[PDB]
Amino acid sequence: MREIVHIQAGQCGNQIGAKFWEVISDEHGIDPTGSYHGDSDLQLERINVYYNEATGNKYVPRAILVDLEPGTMDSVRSGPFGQIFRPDNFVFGQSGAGNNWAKGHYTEGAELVDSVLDVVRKESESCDCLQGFQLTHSLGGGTGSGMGTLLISKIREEYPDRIMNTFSVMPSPKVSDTVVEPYNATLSVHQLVENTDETYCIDNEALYDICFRTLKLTTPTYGDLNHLVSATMSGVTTCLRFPGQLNADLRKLAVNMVPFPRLHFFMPGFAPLTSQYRALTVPELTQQMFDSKNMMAACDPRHGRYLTVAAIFRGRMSMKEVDEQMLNVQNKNSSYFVEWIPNNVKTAVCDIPPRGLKMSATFIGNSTAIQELFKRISEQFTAMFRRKAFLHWYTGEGMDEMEFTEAESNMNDLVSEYQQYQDA
Amino acid sequence: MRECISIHVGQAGVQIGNACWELYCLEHGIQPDGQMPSDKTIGGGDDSFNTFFSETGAGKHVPRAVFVDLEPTVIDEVRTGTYRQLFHPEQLITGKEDAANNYARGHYTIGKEIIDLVLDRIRKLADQCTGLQGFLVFHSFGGGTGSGFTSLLMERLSVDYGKKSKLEFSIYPAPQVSTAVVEPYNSILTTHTTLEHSDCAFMVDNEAIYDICRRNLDIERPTYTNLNRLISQIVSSITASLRFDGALNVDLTEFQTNLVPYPRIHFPLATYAPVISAEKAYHEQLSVAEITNACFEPANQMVKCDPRHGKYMACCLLYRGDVVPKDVNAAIATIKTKRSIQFVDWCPTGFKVGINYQPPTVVPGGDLAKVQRAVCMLSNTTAIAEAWARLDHKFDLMYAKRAFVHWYVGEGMEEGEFSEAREDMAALEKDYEEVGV
Amino acid sequence: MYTFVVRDENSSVYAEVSRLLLATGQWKRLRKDNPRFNLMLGERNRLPFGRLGHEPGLVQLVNYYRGADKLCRKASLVKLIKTSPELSESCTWFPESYVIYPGNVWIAKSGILISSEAHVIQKYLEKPLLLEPGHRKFDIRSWVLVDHLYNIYLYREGVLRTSSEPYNSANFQDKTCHLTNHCIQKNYGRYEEGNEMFFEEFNQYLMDALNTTLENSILLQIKHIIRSCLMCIEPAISTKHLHYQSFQLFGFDFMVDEELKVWLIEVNGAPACAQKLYAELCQGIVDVAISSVFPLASIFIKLHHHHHH
Amino acid sequence: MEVIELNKCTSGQSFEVILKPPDPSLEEIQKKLEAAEERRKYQEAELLKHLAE
């Protein structure tokens, strides 16, 4: 259980996907040409998880780069770390998906999916022990959403026994490309409830609010939102990437976090929220990573209960002080955990801090309060679908209304299922 | 003499294995390369220590050990570590994919595809034995491999060695040093499936050991290394009688006779004293009276429970160091008056005593100070049922909601195996209460 | 903020201890099955002591001593007094009691048979002490609080549970003059309110009719019997060096005979506090047994006597 | 309190002190290991059938 295959699909997928490779490459001491120049040996002990070793002692991300249009992928090559990616692993169409799920999933996307799978297969073949896949994408457009979910379906057919992990950016009217975002996101969630083991809900509403309210940025850009996303992605992959004493993998993440197969949508958290000089104290990190204002999914965790929780502290600190602070919230806020999963909070500590910060915490919560995110997309869906508004973009690609009713129903079902366990 | 085979399953099994074999080698004067200078019979022997070590012509002393882990990272540290020359690679068995803290995946899925191979390496060891006694099996309750693969081996050992004794050293799960949320599930399942296959089981609560390391060794945050060096001392006390000259607990059969009259109720409580910090500048050495008394303090038990609220079926006192019987009896007299040591009506209120004049060996640069005398008590007390109740209650809070069950069913295991395993454990709790009140 | 749970409904005393605890602003009550408490206020039967003291980062207290049942059942009290060297078979302050399983007047109990003909048979006190005017029987009830360090605290307020009918020699079957409970007696309240005389008035009656005080005539013997009983079982039930901690409120029941000798009748493991007194006692429980272990932001006489021999 | 069965040697001594007197077959295992692989293969069939739809 060692190699992870990373897929990044569409504009958002390839943008947050690009940042992640810039951030971890710098943590593992890999340079914009793929040459090691670090100091610590810790930086190479589990490098194999995210990198292939090539000729000349080069490190090549196990990264596949997908888009139906050539634009954003020429931007990745242009961009600061663009030379590190295996060139045979860029796969792109010409016509784009135009924010149309049906085009991603069923027409334009169908034509391209087979040639992405071939690159996936190629990466899977020269893997000593594949743990599975992590995909970066938005649910709000056509390619990341529609073609990303088509790929997930096809990877599961060919690899039923490997783990499927997503970083899934939810759309917000506060960062809106188009009115059809709730449509593309509802169709995409149905796919994600059936065919992923773990999904990190990166809510664009949350990223915006954190940038406006709790960071005093009046006009947040995708650059600002993505800074928070790449910090979270660095955080939640720390234990996959570095030794040790946890030695985590994607299956053990799944077994420990998901008590019911459908309830695998994680509320990620980060502390301290940046865009410092004073390092935070362990109690500050602890209070902040459990605070609403620090979650990357716009949900009130006081409206729900935590089923499971994983926390990763980075820097130099007493594990004793981490333990004490992690038991202090559990023993003084027991109402907001379920009594019927004993010892449901797990803490881990890594000595290597992220770039800039001296100590940081990353939160991963399977909270029933995630329902508020799905209900919000449901309501934006119903407000259009009840007048069949903007459907013709989807019927014109061969979709029926039926398939919209089905995706509406499966998302209201997911919301009830979260409700069930909030009152139990 | 009669040979014993030690099987270490999972990370806990294997790391505890390493500590035990480190200590045995120091106790017997065997070096990391496996040469035993004090041993005058070269290429063989029917000495007591030969029950645990085989011998080669070139004069190497080789543990009668099998190490099994479904993943390689932990047994790889044995292969590349201080005691690499000691073991034969055929004894160190690793898969690739671990059980991901899943009983079902350790038993049914990844189990079925490695059992036949382990049994074969076990059989090669049995074939170098003149008169095999049976097996010492080290494992966690909590790991998918420790739980699931262990219970599969114990079924196949029962079939392939019906005559032979099977003893367990089991690590009972503790939230303070815990891997997975599903340890309760894995713990019940492996108990149910191992119950009828095990003759005597020595449970160590990781909570009890962790606290003994906090309280008595002044370690803020104890590590598996600290825990394992202490556990290996208790394990050595218990197995001393198999590896040295004496007349108490001399073969595996006698462990059952002396400690388990009622065969399902076969979990003896280990109590150990004294545990003294090596950092500790000034230490007044404890007497026989003081260390015997320490055996009835719950804070020194391998499992936290109250022996005052339950009945004894057996009590063995295993002394190491400067101890003579008159001091032992004087101590037992004093303590009878001052304490609540109720036995069952159909058992003699009696202590079986073993003394070995060699004090405990400590690992150099270890945490445990050298002492003039130490003792390990083995009481079969119904009070240990407290550990079953605690574990069973945790199982019930999660199973009531079928939480994580789908992870086990997804490997071919049925829901019913859970209720079945839990009913067996409900029966064991009742067995303990009839006998205990 | 500390945390507690309730698992005893009928408990009037821990109803009030719960109420006082909430109304403090530093104590949240949780649901009955929530494992992360500081204090448990536990059920009368089958209390799961095995589960206590295993929760990391939590010091756990419970309001019962495990094995204190042996002092509280009639069947085991008798057996405890007959088989303990510290309370001998020839113990001066326990009425001769016997166990056979399903002046020579006796009484049987666990429907109460008093005859010479006909559970535990007990020597019945043919000549007890009678309050004038009345020629009528009573029983004294003292509330004792054993904390986590096994300090023994007597509450300075007890109470008499009086009859209201002339006690009778030849008439045994009749149950309102012989037996001086509270439930069987509800001439109800003719002489004193609710059949409940208190320590001030009983100290006065004694001074006027018997010239002695309550301290001298009765309370010295009470303090000896409470001390004898709880120091007997201290080795069995003490939670010193244990992974959880116990306290418990006990109610001791006593009789006074004509020559002013104090006998022990029963020890009550889940006792009911008298209506007027609840306020003071329940605040005491909290001050001494609970705030001692869980500090925030004397109504008790402490029992100890080390005579050197 | 009577000290019985005392045995001495040069490494130590042992004695008893008394205060007061008073498995299924290979067939059945390979059977149920296979019944669970048949439940495991069915579940994976049902999954492929559903992905074909």
Ligand SMILES: Nc1nc2c(ncn2[C@@H]2O[C@H](COP(=O)(O)OP(=O)(O)OP(=O)(O)O)[C@@H](O)[C@H]2O)c(=O)[nH]1
């Ligand atoms: N005392 C002690 N307990 C250990 C040790 N290693 C693991 N444990 C405990 O064992 C349980 C976890 O099981 P492991 O032995 O790590 O798992 P495994 O058998 O390797 O199984 P998988 O990795 O799940 O395939 C937890 O209760 C841990 O606290 C160790 O070296 N010493």
Ligand SMILES: Nc1ncnc2c1ncn2[C@@H]1O[C@H](COP(=O)(O)OP(=O)(O)CP(=O)(O)O)[C@@H](O)[C@H]1O
């Ligand atoms: N040996 C004896 N001599 C005289 N009176 C006795 C007696 N034994 C019992 N009694 C009387 O009967 C009553 C006994 O009540 P008992 O203690 O048997 O049960 P109970 O349920 O009332 C316990 P509690 O009163 O503490 O709630 C007392 O009021 C007492 O006067």
Ligand SMILES: Nc1nc2c(ncn2[C@@H]2O[C@H](COP(=O)(O)OP(=O)(O)O)[C@@H](O)[C@H]2O)c(=O)[nH]1
């Ligand atoms: N956080 C974040 N969101 C993005 C980014 N780019 C686009 N989005 C969002 O993603 C959705 C549009 O999807 P996009 O990835 O551009 O569509 P596709 O390229 O056709 O898959 C909308 O909800 C946008 O607000 C980005 O770089 N970061």
Ligand SMILES: COc1cc([C@H]2C(C#N)=C(N)Oc3c2ccc(N)c3N)cc(Br)c1OC
């Ligand atoms: C603390 O960070 C992570 C935890 C886990 C996952 C896991 C692994 N590997 C272990 N063994 O147990 C848990 C785990 C998660 C939650 C809980 N409650 C538990 N017990 C996986 C990863 Br990846 C972690 O880092 C992100």
Ligand SMILES: [Ca+2]
């Ligand atoms: Ca030899």
Ligand SMILES: [Mg+2]
């Ligand atoms: Mg766009």
Ligand SMILES: [Mg+2]
């Ligand atoms: Mg393991």
